[PDB]
């Protein structure tokens, strides 16, 4: 099982910063629905 079944998968690398920023914004904003706030936040973040 050393390498035949274990496929190396690792964090994309720049995901921690995005996730931490999103967590800060979700905590500070305190919205009624998390999905809507996440959608609008990421849409604005993209452009």
């Amino acid at each position: 099982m050393s390498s035949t079944y274990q496929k190396p998968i690792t964090i994309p690398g720049d995901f921690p910063a995005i996730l931490k920023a999103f967590t800060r914004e979700i905590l500070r904003a305190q919205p009624s629905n998390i999905y809507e706030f996440g959608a609008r936040y990421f849409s604005g973040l993209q452009g």
């Binding site: 079944y5 496929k7 998968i9 964090i11 996730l19 931490k20 967590t23 800060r24 905590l27 500070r28």
Partner: protein
Amino acid sequence: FEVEPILEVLVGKVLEQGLMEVLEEEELAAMRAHQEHFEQIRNAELVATQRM
């Protein structure tokens, strides 16, 4: 400055737990696919013998 530790804790939880879960799910999926492949070979051989 005060919300930073809560962010750090929750983010650590999410990252490590998600990574562990994805690795283990993938590993079991690979092993079970291998076993299914061998079973498929065996079934094909059975069908050939029945045909003869």
